From a paper:
[name] could not be crystallized in its open, resting state conformation, but co-crystallization with the non-hydrolysable FPP substrate mimic (4-amino-1-hydroxybutylidene)bisphosphonic acid (alendronate, AHD) and MgCl2 resulted in crystals suitable for the collection of X-ray diffraction data. The obtained structure thus represents the closed, catalytically active [name] ([name]·Mg3·AHD) conformation. The enzyme forms a homodimer both in crystallo and in solution as observed in size exclusion chromatography. Inspection of the electron density clearly revealed bound AHD and the presence of three Mg2+ cations in a closed conformation. While TPSs generally are helical bundle proteins lacking any β-strands, two short β-strands are present in [name], one at the N- and one at the C-terminal ends. These two β-strands (T17-L21 and R335-L339) form an antiparallel β-sheet, which might further stabilize the closed conformation. [name] shows the classical 99DDWLD103 (located on α-helix C) and 235NSE243 (located on the opposing α-helix H) motifs. The C-terminal 317WxxxxxRY324 motif adopts a random coil conformation and folds onto the active site, reflecting the closed conformation of [name].
All class I TPSs share highly conserved sequence motifs in their respective α-domains, such as the aspartate-rich DDXXD (DD) dyad and the (N,D)D(L,I,V)X(S,T)XXXE (NSE) triad, with both being involved in complexing of three Mg2+ ions that are essential for catalysis.
Author numbering:
A (entry chain B): 15 to 348
B (entry chain A): 14 to 348
Amino acid sequence: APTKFILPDLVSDCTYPLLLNDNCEPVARASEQWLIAGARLQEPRRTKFMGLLAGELTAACYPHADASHLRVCVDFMNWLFNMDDWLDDFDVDDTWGMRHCCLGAFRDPVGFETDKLGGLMSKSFFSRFRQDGGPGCTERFIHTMDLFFIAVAQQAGDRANGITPDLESYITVRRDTSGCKPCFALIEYAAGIDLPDHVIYHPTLAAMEEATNDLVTWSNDIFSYNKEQVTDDTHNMIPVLMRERGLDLQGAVDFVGRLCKGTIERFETERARLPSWGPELDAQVQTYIEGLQNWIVGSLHWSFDSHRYFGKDGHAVKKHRIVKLLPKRVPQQA
Amino acid sequence: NAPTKFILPDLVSDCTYPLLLNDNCEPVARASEQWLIAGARLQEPRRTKFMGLLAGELTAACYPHADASHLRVCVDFMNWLFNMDDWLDDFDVDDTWGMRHCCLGAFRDPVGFETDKLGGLMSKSFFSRFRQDGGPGCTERFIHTMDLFFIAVAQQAGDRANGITPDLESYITVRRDTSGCKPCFALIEYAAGIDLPDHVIYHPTLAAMEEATNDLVTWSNDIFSYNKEQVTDDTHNMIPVLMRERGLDLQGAVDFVGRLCKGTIERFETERARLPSWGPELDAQVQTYIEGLQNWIVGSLHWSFDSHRYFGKDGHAVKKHRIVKLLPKRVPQQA
Ligand SMILES: [Mg+2]
Ligand SMILES: [Mg+2]
Ligand SMILES: [Mg+2]
Ligand SMILES: [Mg+2]
Ligand SMILES: [Mg+2]
Ligand SMILES: [Mg+2]
């Protein structure tokens, strides 16, 4: 039975420039207070939340957003991390109820009545989104949030059933529980563009999005395996692989690490394949894929600034790459 | 040397689902043909080809319990879909997006949408009648999966323009949307007078039964329609995809898709056996929906040999002897 594992080196390979929005510090602090208020955070969660640093993630992923747009992005990211953590303790029925409240607020903030914190916060940041977002990325945001909730209901069912999914079913569902897709809609929003359907749904752009989704998500599976195995959460490629393929822990970890390198190569390979829709649209496409690039480098690095995955030891673990497994809530041999 | 023929896997002689036929089939079938001919302005030779399609008969087998008015909306859609598919075989990517814009505009506003395009005028005709009784859930599933269909066919059209045979993994993903099975499934709800709630119909076991049904209907179509599609070297078909990716010969790829077809019917039964319960009212609506999926499997398999679309006048002979004589290519392969 293993007590630790070695992190694949994903950061030293990546040569994209790491940027940080000039508006980062005041917006991050303000959004921290918006979340504590909106989720009614109390200890212990409140202190854990102050080491999340989603505002600093968001500032690295949308480094050119103006202050108004950045704050909508950060509020969403704080809301998303809070929503994720809440839903880790929801059953299937209550997941659908939360889906109903939040999508109701996104689609009809004026007419949708609700007194739930999830939906109240949803109206707050999304009614600020709606002041500027184009109709295309508005609907991509709502539709991919819908996909998020549907997939997390499937995760909640697997958890209640004590199931570990098979690999090809996991990958399919995980692309939606990650939440990367609505973050992509925020790229458009925060850059002040609204890509046409025939551009955004072209297979090469769709493939670059997926490549980015997989990079962020499968690397998150590596970085977050430690906090997730505490409660034997199997919505993570590592236990999925271990069960399906008989891999031990480091074997599974290394297999996922290879997948991560391979998806950045996929991203660059499709980047070369991009067609041209003339100068104005080509320039908006470049802006969008730079946002996908910023998600790649930004998230990889932020995972070690946050307290969420490595506690206080983030910068230290970035250097020596050894992860000591946390104690399980219930011992494996209980 | 290159093959002139291949052998059809036996897909029908083991399928044990009862084959049903709507009581209203014959008069609805004939009225819809006239609707389509007028709406698409069909002329010869296409008009005579269309009189051998028999999409009304297919539709009456897939929705055998619909009343006459709901059946007629389904048959109009089916005639419109086959017509649209054939038109789009000769559209470029730009014009495909243009058709998509017209038809989705029509679906979303089936009385007020201003258009003079035949594709959209017909969309307004059948979908205005659809919305007279379709629930909000299946209405949006129809529209959104028609959206997915157009997006996917635009990808097909780009592949065709580029001379590209896709890889198998990418092909299967896109093909679940170019088939148009997903909007057919929304019509199961409409035609049964039900409107399943989000938490039921997007439950993973129903979504899996839908995909298993999609895959049966679609991959079996790749087999039946390979002959007509290869005439123009159309590679949006798992058979040329398999030959290119895995070096199989024709019979080997055909046999491979055959095994897949048996495996997806098995998947449907396996998921069927672990359906959850939402109580008696919802459970009855789920059983009604699942029987619709069932009727699509058995109906489409038998219909493919009644139609002239795939085997011309020889479907019943081919169903029994299973030898497919390859049609002449438009341009010979060694040209
Ligand atoms: Mg989660
Ligand atoms: Mg989580
Ligand atoms: Mg995680
Ligand atoms: Mg087609
Ligand atoms: Mg076709
Ligand atoms: Mg076909």
